[PDB]
Amino acid sequence: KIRIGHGFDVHKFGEPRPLILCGVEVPYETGLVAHSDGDVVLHAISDAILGAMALGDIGKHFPDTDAAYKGADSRVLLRHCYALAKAKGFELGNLDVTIIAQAPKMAPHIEDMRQVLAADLNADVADINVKATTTEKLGFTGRKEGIAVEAVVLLSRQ
Amino acid sequence: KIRIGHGFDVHKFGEPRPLILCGVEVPYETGLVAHSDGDVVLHAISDAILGAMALGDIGKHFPDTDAAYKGADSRVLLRHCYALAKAKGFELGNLDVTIIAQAPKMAPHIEDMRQVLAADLNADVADINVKATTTEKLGFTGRKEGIAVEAVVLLSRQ
Amino acid sequence: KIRIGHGFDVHKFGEPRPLILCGVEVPYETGLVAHSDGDVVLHAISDAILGAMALGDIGKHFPDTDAAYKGADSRVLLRHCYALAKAKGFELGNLDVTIIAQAPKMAPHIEDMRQVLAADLNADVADINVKATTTEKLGFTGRKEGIAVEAVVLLSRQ
Ligand SMILES: CC(C)=CCC/C(C)=C/CC/C(C)=C/COP(=O)(O)OP(=O)(O)O
Ligand SMILES: [Co+2]
Ligand SMILES: [Co+2]
Ligand SMILES: [Co+2]
Ligand SMILES: [Zn+2]
Ligand SMILES: [Zn+2]
Ligand SMILES: [Zn+2]
C-alpha cells in the first residue's frame, strides 16, 4: 500500500532570531515568527506525513497554546510524526518540497537541508528533494512578508 | 494502477448564506460567493478526483454559465465526480486535504468533515485526512478575504 | 517503484510578447516576464519531474544568470527534464496540472495544451490532465498581476 500526503505552511518574517529552514541556519536579517523555532519547511513536511497517515495535523499534535513547544526544535516534531508513520508500518517512499520565498537565496543550503531530512527520516537522500522558487515579487512572499512551503510525500508499507 | 490528482480552489467571503465547508455548516458572519453552494473544500477534492482521472475540472463538468448548477450542493457534485472515477474502475486510495484560512476556526469541525467524506466516497475514514492551517495573517486568506483549499488524492484500480 | 513530484511556479505579466502557456499561444494583451519564454506551466511541470527524481529544480539546471537560456522555448527544458527521468529508468505514470489565473480564459486551450504534453512526454493523453481555476479576484492572481501553476506527477519505473 502506498499513501499520499500534502503539507502547506506559512510564517511571517520579523522575529529577531536565527532563520532555521529545514534544520539549517540560513543567514538573514531577521527570522520567522512562530511558537516553535519557526521552521516552516519542517512543519510543512510534518503535516504531509501526518496527512498521508490520516493523523490530522501539527496543530492537533503540537498546539501553540502549550508552552511545552515554545521555541522547540522542529526536528523533534518531524521525528515524532515520522515515528508515528513507522509505528503504523510505513516508511518513506519519496518526498518533494517547494520553498516559496523571495529571499534569502536557498541554493547554497539545499544539500545541507536534504541531509537533515535523510537523517531524520532514516532515508536515502535519493528519496528526498528540496526545491525553491520565488513568486517574482508578487503576493505576500514577493513582498518579503514571510515564507511559504509546499510538500508532498509518498509513504509505503514496510 | 495508481493515479494521483491535485485540486486547488478559492472563494471570497461575502454571500449572505450558510458557510458550508466539506459539507459541514461552520458558524460565521457570512458565507462564500460562488455559482454553486460555495463549498471550497469539496470543490478542491472534486478537482483532485477529476484530475487524477484526466477528466478535466469542475469548470467543465459543472459550468458557472449553467443554470442547472446554480446553488448546487457540492456533496452531490463530489459524488458525481467519484462516480465517474468508479465507472473507470478506480476507487479511493487515500485523500489528504489542506484548508488554508485565518477564520473561521476549523478544528472543532474536522471530524465531522472527515465523516462527510467517508459517507460520500463510501470509504473508510482511515483513508481520509482533513487539515487546516492559517497563513499567520498573510495574504488574502490571512486577511480573512476568503478561503483556499488544496487537496491531493491517490486513486487505485478496483 | 513509483515516485511523486510537486511543482510550483509564478511569473508576472508585463512583457510585450506572445503569452505561451503549456506550449500554446493564448491571446492576451501582454505576456509573462521571465528569462526563458516565460511558460509558467511547463516550468511547474518540469520542477515536478525533477522533484520526483530528486534532481533539484529548474533554477539549478537552467540558471537565469546564463544567457544560453534567454528566450528559450520551455519545451526544450521540459524535454531535458523528462529525458533525465527516462535515463534513470522512469516514465510518466500520470500528471495533473492546475493553472491558477483570473485571465485569460484557459478552457479553449486545454486540449491543445494536453497534446503538447502528450508529445513531449511521449505519453497517452489519458495520463495527462490540465485544469484551471481562478481565485475569485483575490490575491496577485485575482488582481491579474500574474499566473501561478501547481503540478503533481507520478513517475513509475519502466
Ligand atoms: C498562499 C497560498 C494559498 C499559496 C499556495 C500557492 C499559491 C501562491 C497559489 C496562487 C494563488 C494564490 C493563493 C495567490 C496568493 O496571493 P497573495 O495572498 O500572496 O496576495 P496578496 O497579499 O498580495 O493579496
Ligand atoms: Co501551519
Ligand atoms: Co475553482
Ligand atoms: Co520559478
Ligand atoms: Zn509552522
Ligand atoms: Zn469552487
Ligand atoms: Zn518559471
Side-chain angles (χ1 to χ4, degrees), chain C residues 25-76:
Chain C
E25 192 167 334
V26 176
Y28 202 57
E29 64 189 65
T30 188
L32 290 168
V33 181
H35 185 55
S36 67
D37 66 5
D39 196 328
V40 61
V41 189
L42 296 185
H43 295 183
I45 295 166
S46 297
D47 260 355
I49 291 170
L50 293 175
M53 301 304 304
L55 299 178
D57 57 49
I58 57 183
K60 188 222 88 82
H61 290 258
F62 320 114
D64 282 6
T65 51
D66 187 344
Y69 311 103
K70 188 140 156 46
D73 186 320
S74 289
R75 298 181 65 175
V76 180

Side-chain angles (χ1 to χ4, degrees), chain A residues 7-134:
Chain A
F8 184 74
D9 200 18
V10 169
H11 294 280
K12 69 177 342 276
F13 286 126
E15 195 60 44
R17 73 175 170 190
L19 211 211
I20 302 162
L21 296 172
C22 205
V24 175
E25 190 172 334
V26 176
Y28 204 59
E29 46 151 305
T30 187
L32 290 173
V33 175
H35 192 232
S36 68
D37 69 1
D39 197 330
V40 60
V41 190
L42 295 189
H43 294 181
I45 296 168
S46 299
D47 259 353
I49 293 167
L50 291 176
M53 300 305 318
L55 296 175
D57 64 45
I58 60 181
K60 181 169 292 118
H61 291 258
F62 320 114
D64 286 3
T65 52
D66 192 340
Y69 307 106
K70 183 78 173 320
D73 189 319
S74 288
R75 295 178 74 173
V76 176
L77 311 190
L78 175 69
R79 295 199 289 229
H80 177 134
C81 295
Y82 191 60
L84 294 182
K86 287 293 233 147
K88 291 175 82 76
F90 285 79
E91 67 186 353
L92 182 67
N94 80 291
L95 172 68
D96 191 18
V97 181
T98 304
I99 297 172
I100 305 164
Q102 193 64 41
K105 289 178 204 213
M106 301 298 161
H109 310 288
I110 293 296
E111 300 307 323
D112 290 340
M113 293 173 177
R114 295 177 71 210
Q115 294 294 331
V116 160
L117 296 175
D120 292 348
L121 304 180
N122 187 32
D124 291 327
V125 81
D127 294 337
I128 294 162
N129 198 66
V130 180
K131 302 196 296 315
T133 184
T134 76

Side-chain angles (χ1 to χ4, degrees), chain B:
Chain B
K1 305 283 107 62
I2 56 257
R3 296 181 60 103
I4 188 168
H6 172 262
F8 184 73
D9 197 24
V10 169
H11 291 282
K12 185 183 180 309
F13 287 125
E15 184 73 39
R17 71 181 158 187
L19 179 60
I20 310 185
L21 265 359
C22 205
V24 173
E25 169 158 12
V26 181
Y28 202 59
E29 70 193 63
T30 187
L32 291 167
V33 177
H35 188 236
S36 64
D37 71 2
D39 192 329
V40 63
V41 192
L42 296 187
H43 290 184
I45 296 168
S46 296
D47 262 356
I49 288 166
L50 293 174
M53 299 300 327
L55 295 175
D57 59 43
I58 61 175
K60 182 174 75 138
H61 290 265
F62 318 123
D64 270 21
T65 291
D66 206 312
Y69 292 108
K70 178 75 166 304
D73 186 288
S74 293
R75 295 175 75 176
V76 175
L77 303 182
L78 174 57
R79 289 255 259 297
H80 176 134
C81 294
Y82 193 55
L84 300 180
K86 288 200 62 250
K88 284 170 107 63
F90 284 82
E91 65 187 351
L92 183 66
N94 80 291
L95 172 67
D96 188 25
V97 179
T98 304
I99 302 168
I100 304 166
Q102 200 65 36
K105 180 134 207 151
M106 307 292 168
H109 311 285
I110 296 290
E111 299 303 325
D112 288 343
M113 295 175 172
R114 297 178 70 213
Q115 291 295 327
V116 161
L117 294 172
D120 291 354
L121 301 179
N122 188 214
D124 288 325
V125 81
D127 294 334
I128 290 162
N129 199 65
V130 180
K131 307 190 294 314
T133 187
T134 77
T135 55
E136 294 278 306
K137 302 190 199 292
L138 302 184
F140 64 84
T141 62
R143 298 184 308 270
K144 307 176 182 184
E145 295 182 4
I147 296 175
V149 181
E150 289 209 69
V152 295
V153 72
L154 228 42
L155 305 178
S156 49
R157 188 67 196 207
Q158 251 60 281

Side-chain angles (χ1 to χ4, degrees), chain B residues 2-12 33-34 47-48 50-52 54-57 140 143 145-146 150 154, chain C residues 2 4 6 93-96 98 100 114 125-136 138-139 143 150 152-154:
Chain B
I2 56 257
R3 296 181 60 103
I4 188 168
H6 172 262
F8 184 73
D9 197 24
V10 169
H11 291 282
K12 185 183 180 309
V33 177
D47 262 356
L50 293 174
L55 295 175
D57 59 43
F140 64 84
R143 298 184 308 270
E145 295 182 4
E150 289 209 69
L154 228 42
Chain C
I2 62 169
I4 191 169
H6 170 262
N94 80 290
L95 175 68
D96 190 23
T98 306
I100 305 166
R114 296 175 73 214
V125 83
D127 297 334
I128 293 164
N129 199 66
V130 180
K131 303 193 296 312
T133 185
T134 78
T135 57
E136 295 271 26
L138 304 184
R143 291 189 305 274
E150 281 209 83
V152 298
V153 75
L154 188 151

